[PDB]
Design an enzyme around this catalytic site. Structure first.
Site, short mmCIF file in Angstrom:
data_model
loop_
_atom_site.label_atom_id
_atom_site.label_comp_id
_atom_site.label_asym_id
_atom_site.label_seq_id
_atom_site.Cartn_x
_atom_site.Cartn_y
_atom_site.Cartn_z
N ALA A 8 49.25 62.84 1.36
CA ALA A 8 49.46 63.26 2.73
C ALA A 8 49.26 62.06 3.68
O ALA A 8 48.40 61.21 3.45
CB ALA A 8 48.53 64.41 3.03
N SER A 9 50.11 61.98 4.70
CA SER A 9 50.00 60.96 5.70
C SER A 9 49.18 61.44 6.89
O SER A 9 48.74 60.60 7.67
CB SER A 9 51.41 60.49 6.15
OG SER A 9 52.06 61.55 6.77
N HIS A 19 57.39 77.42 -2.14
CA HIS A 19 58.12 76.59 -3.12
C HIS A 19 59.36 77.30 -3.77
O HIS A 19 59.81 76.86 -4.85
CB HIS A 19 57.14 75.99 -4.18
CG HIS A 19 56.11 75.06 -3.59
ND1 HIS A 19 55.00 74.62 -4.30
CD2 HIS A 19 56.00 74.51 -2.35
CE1 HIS A 19 54.27 73.82 -3.53
NE2 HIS A 19 54.85 73.74 -2.34
N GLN A 66 52.31 81.13 -5.04
CA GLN A 66 53.03 79.89 -5.02
C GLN A 66 53.44 79.45 -6.46
O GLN A 66 54.60 79.01 -6.68
CB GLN A 66 52.24 78.78 -4.25
CG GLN A 66 52.97 77.44 -4.22
CD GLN A 66 52.34 76.47 -3.24
OE1 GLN A 66 52.62 76.55 -2.05
NE2 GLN A 66 51.52 75.52 -3.74
N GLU A 67 52.51 79.51 -7.40
CA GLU A 67 52.85 79.29 -8.82
C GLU A 67 52.04 80.08 -9.80
O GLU A 67 50.86 80.32 -9.59
CB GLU A 67 52.79 77.81 -9.28
CG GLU A 67 52.07 76.83 -8.38
CD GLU A 67 51.56 75.58 -9.12
OE1 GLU A 67 51.96 75.26 -10.28
OE2 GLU A 67 50.73 74.90 -8.51
N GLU A 123 58.00 70.34 -9.91
CA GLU A 123 57.05 70.33 -11.04
C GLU A 123 57.73 70.66 -12.37
O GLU A 123 57.04 70.74 -13.38
CB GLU A 123 55.87 71.36 -10.85
CG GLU A 123 55.07 71.38 -9.52
CD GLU A 123 55.65 72.34 -8.44
OE1 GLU A 123 56.85 72.81 -8.54
OE2 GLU A 123 54.88 72.61 -7.47
N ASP A 128 48.15 79.78 -8.65
CA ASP A 128 47.81 79.11 -7.40
C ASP A 128 48.41 79.98 -6.31
O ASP A 128 49.64 80.02 -6.16
CB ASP A 128 48.46 77.73 -7.36
CG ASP A 128 48.30 77.02 -6.02
OD1 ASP A 128 47.48 77.47 -5.18
OD2 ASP A 128 49.03 76.03 -5.79
N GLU A 168 43.73 79.67 -8.20
CA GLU A 168 43.53 78.54 -7.31
C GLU A 168 43.86 78.91 -5.86
O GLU A 168 44.87 79.55 -5.59
CB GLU A 168 44.40 77.35 -7.81
CG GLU A 168 44.48 76.12 -6.94
CD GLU A 168 45.57 75.13 -7.38
OE1 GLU A 168 45.77 74.99 -8.62
OE2 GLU A 168 46.23 74.53 -6.49
N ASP A 184 41.59 73.89 -4.31
CA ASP A 184 42.52 72.77 -4.16
C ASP A 184 42.39 72.30 -2.68
O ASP A 184 41.61 71.37 -2.38
CB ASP A 184 43.97 73.19 -4.58
CG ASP A 184 45.08 72.12 -4.20
OD1 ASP A 184 44.72 70.92 -4.09
OD2 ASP A 184 46.29 72.50 -4.04
N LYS A 219 42.59 65.42 -7.50
CA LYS A 219 43.73 64.65 -7.09
C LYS A 219 43.31 63.24 -6.66
O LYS A 219 42.82 62.98 -5.49
CB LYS A 219 44.40 65.38 -5.95
CG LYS A 219 45.12 66.62 -6.36
CD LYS A 219 45.83 67.29 -5.19
CE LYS A 219 46.61 68.51 -5.69
NZ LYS A 219 47.16 69.39 -4.62
N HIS A 252 48.28 66.56 -11.02
CA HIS A 252 49.42 65.82 -10.53
C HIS A 252 49.57 66.01 -9.02
O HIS A 252 48.82 66.78 -8.37
CB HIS A 252 50.70 66.29 -11.28
CG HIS A 252 51.11 67.74 -11.07
ND1 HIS A 252 50.51 68.61 -10.16
CD2 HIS A 252 52.05 68.48 -11.68
CE1 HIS A 252 51.07 69.80 -10.24
NE2 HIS A 252 52.01 69.75 -11.15
N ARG A 253 50.62 65.41 -8.50
CA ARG A 253 51.10 65.72 -7.16
C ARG A 253 52.59 66.11 -7.24
O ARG A 253 53.23 65.97 -8.28
CB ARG A 253 50.89 64.49 -6.22
CG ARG A 253 49.43 64.01 -6.08
CD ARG A 253 48.49 65.07 -5.54
NE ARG A 253 48.91 65.59 -4.26
CZ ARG A 253 48.45 65.19 -3.06
NH1 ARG A 253 47.50 64.25 -2.96
NH2 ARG A 253 48.92 65.75 -1.94
N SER A 254 53.13 66.60 -6.15
CA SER A 254 54.57 66.89 -6.05
C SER A 254 55.48 65.72 -6.36
O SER A 254 56.44 65.83 -7.11
CB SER A 254 54.87 67.36 -4.64
OG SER A 254 54.56 68.71 -4.70
N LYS A 300 46.48 69.78 -14.97
CA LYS A 300 47.55 70.50 -14.39
C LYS A 300 48.60 69.47 -14.03
O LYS A 300 48.52 68.87 -12.98
CB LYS A 300 47.06 71.24 -13.15
CG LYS A 300 48.16 71.96 -12.40
CD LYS A 300 47.67 72.35 -11.02
CE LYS A 300 48.72 73.15 -10.30
NZ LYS A 300 48.25 73.53 -8.96
MG LIG Z 1 47.05 75.10 -3.59
#
Ligand SMILES: [Mg+2]
Ligand SMILES: [Mg+2]
Lengths: 439, 439
Positions: free
Chosen positions: A48-49, A166, A174-175, A216, A253, A297, A324, A349, A377-379, A400
């Site tokens: 993330a920025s 997603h 979400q997943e 993913e 999640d 999650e 998370d 992460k 992981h990340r996206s 994961k």
């Molecule tokens: Mg999450």
């Protein structure tokens, strides 16, 4: 009377470069070169920025390159001041290396150089040091972790069906993920995962649904509810010859922040019903009775600590409850979560905290409190498979890192394969007993 | 009076293992270890297990492992007979190493051991020898190819939209690709690719279409015609700030064998119109007048050589005509095609021929006839990025290694970036002039 080259572990050159991640966005790769000739090379996944609680990756914001997502500034930090401050330091002193970068960036969230610059150099350092020590990375990591020779192959939770933000579907969660807990090796686990994934594609094709994949590597078909998502998974597991419960458990999640709105949780794909924290918890509990969901999650919003204390009370003895967005790999937040009985597990992460040394510290805090640590992981990922070595070298016990498609994901499963081949039963695959709430 | 380690290039050990490719299917990975301590490691992409014209990989057919697609036998071949025939040979003699594996396998099509076992070892060997010689793989390949220090960065053709058998849509053409011919470096080309790819996602979202990706990392949205596929590409290219024609050209793969029925080409998304060879060639001609399509792959069935002789007469001066299915990287077929004026380009799939030495011979036969060689991926890839070094070391001039997503694809792009960093203008990016039919 002669000094081996292994002993010339001072840093003499660091190179950074802009490469591409698995979503096509830039990220940073670094090379650390030691006097003795050793080289380590690592890349940071996407982060993330913006955000008030985690370490921030630095993006250029130049609209004429990569839609504002260039990382030339982070790369110039690696090539200029990071390199200059590390030249002549001993790569084997991971904690000293990371401290110098942390102190030189000078901010709490790594926003001057970017968590992306700093992580990439942190891990490339570690690989270069591993090489100078004459050992694979997972062995170096275990040494740096204060747990020499102590390893485990982690139980994977594998993305398989996506919903929420997603997906274009009527799935709120979400997943959904499968975990091959009945496997006796990670190689077996990976094969069971693959088999289920291929059987799911057949199930979905027979229902007229799309088998193209998301970030993913899992499926985001136009399923009509949360229930239909779980039914196709159960159907694919059975068609692969496995038994839900004994061979394969489920994990989810919820990303429950995405449906939180005025203190209620609102689910489009259950008639737009509103739920209190507690009622949402009961909703999740009902899913855990119908299906062997053993890990959940972000089952409530990151701000809903009263609600997470409740959920942890109701479900925490039998269900792994993974923070998370709750904790964002931040040990000041995890510490306080522990003291308040909030969740029992944390997603790790490494680019959310931004250095190898701090990542080990987060995993240790989890473990000392009885929490589980799930390496994530990340996206946007890369070719780099460092999270596999991390998970083995810290005996994290779970990982994961995606569905069983796309090499951004699968390169990690392959690395876990190569690791287990060398280690055999010195890295036991422990199955369901890794998961918080089982016995 | 002292012999360096680099002179100790005898093979002392070969290790094979079964790892996972980007679609979740097994493939072979090999490591070749040399006396002086040098190691090369490489994986073969997915190939065909059946066919009469190409090298065949060897799958187990045990239905209880990976739906029959295990490669344990190919792996045993590496660990036993291939290893034993190579211990004590000089890895720097690539042609000799390849010749021994070919003769010991003893079949015309590598079916005893599998093209997967042979290629994996062949490439691992080349990497081990490159390290013994003190050079990167691209430099070594150029020496093996008979073209020392001659390099170029290839012009990529990037999968963007899928149709035919690779999508549920009304696009008959199997894929549309973009080519950033206007870039001056492969780094810039890659960035242009990314930007167009991200703009295409926004166009597809605004149209309510799906942005999940196929095997190659591009999109397969529910478009209603070939015209619409070409219109959304045009629109994305313009939104990215580039100009169709000057900056970005288009390449396509008809895979025309998928709609070849009783001597006629039958296109679903064109009213179900039937076409003779000759009429289908004039249909393609018209697309090349309406849109800057400069390359067409498998524009007619592989058996339709009279047709291809006619298409080449008509289009060949102005359009690159790429044989894929037409030649299957088989020099016996290519030689005959060259004699009969069939196509003017060939897709090189190194696992379709099965060794590095024969892959170099394929590329040489193409170039000596003035055909272009486009180095290609397969639908099941790995993290391995050897096709990037191959393209550069042979100065192939073009590469087809996917869309700008999925690390199975993007790993290749990243490796092209690292190579061009080191080589600069010693590896010119020649742009449009690499393409057969351009001035
Ligand atoms: Mg999450
Ligand atoms: Mg084709």
């Amino acid at each position: 009377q002669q000094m081996g080259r292994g002993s010339m572990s001072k840093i003499v050159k660091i190179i950074g470069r802009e490469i591409i991640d698995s979503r096509g966005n830039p990220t940073v790769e670094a090379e650390v070169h030691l006097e003795g000739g050793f080289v380590g090379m690592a890349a940071a996944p996407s982060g993330a920025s913006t955000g008030s609680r985690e370490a921030l990756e630095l993006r250029d914001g130049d609209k004429s390159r990569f839609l504002g997502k260039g990382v030339t500034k982070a790369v110039a930090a690696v090539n200029g001041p990071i390199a200059q401050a590390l030249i002549g330091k001993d790569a084997k002193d991971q904690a000293g290396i990371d401290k110098i970068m942390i102190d030189l960036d000078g901010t709490e969230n790594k926003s001057k150089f970017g968590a992306n610059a700093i992580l990439a150099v942190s891990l490339a350092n570690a690989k270069a040091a591993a090489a100078a020590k004459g050992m694979p990375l997972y062995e170096h990591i275990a040494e740096l972790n204060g747990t020499p020779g102590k390893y485990s192959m982690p139980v994977p939770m594998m993305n398989i069906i996506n919903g929420g933000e997603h997906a274009d579907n009527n799935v709120d969660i979400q997943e959904f993920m499968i975990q091959p807990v009945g496997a006796k090796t990670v190689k077996e686990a990976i094969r069971m995962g693959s088999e289920v994934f291929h059987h799911l594609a057949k199930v979905l094709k027979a229902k007229g649904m799309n088998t193209a994949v998301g970030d993913e590597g899992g499926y985001a078909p136009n399923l009509g509810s949360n229930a239909e998502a779980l039914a196709v998974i159960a159907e694919a597991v059975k068609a692969a010859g496995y038994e839900l419960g004994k061979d394969i458990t489920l994990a989810m999640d919820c990303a429950a922040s995405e449906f939180y709105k005025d203190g209620k949780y609102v689910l489009a794909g259950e008639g737009n019903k509103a739920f209190t924290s507690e009622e949402f918890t009961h909703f999740l509990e009902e899913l855990t009775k119908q299906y062997p969901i053993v890990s959940i999650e972000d089952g409530l919003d990151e701000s809903d600590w009263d609600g997470f204390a409740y959920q942890t009370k109701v479900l925490g003895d039998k269900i792994q409850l993974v923070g998370d967005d709750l904790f964002v790999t931040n040990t000041k937040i995890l510490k306080e979560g522990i003291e308040k009985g909030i969740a029992n597990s944390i997603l790790i992460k490494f680019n959310q905290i931004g250095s190898l040394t701090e990542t080990l510290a987060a995993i240790k805090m989890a473990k000392d409190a009885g929490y589980t640590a799930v390496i994530s992981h990340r996206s946007g990922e890369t070719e780099d498979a460092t999270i596999a070595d991390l998970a083995v070298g810290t005996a994290a016990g779970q990982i994961k890192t995606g569905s069983m498609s796309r090499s951004d994901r699968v390169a990690k499963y392959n690395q876990l394969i190569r690791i287990e081949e060398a280690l055999g039963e010195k890295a036991p695959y422990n199955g369901r007993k890794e998961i918080k709430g089982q016995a």
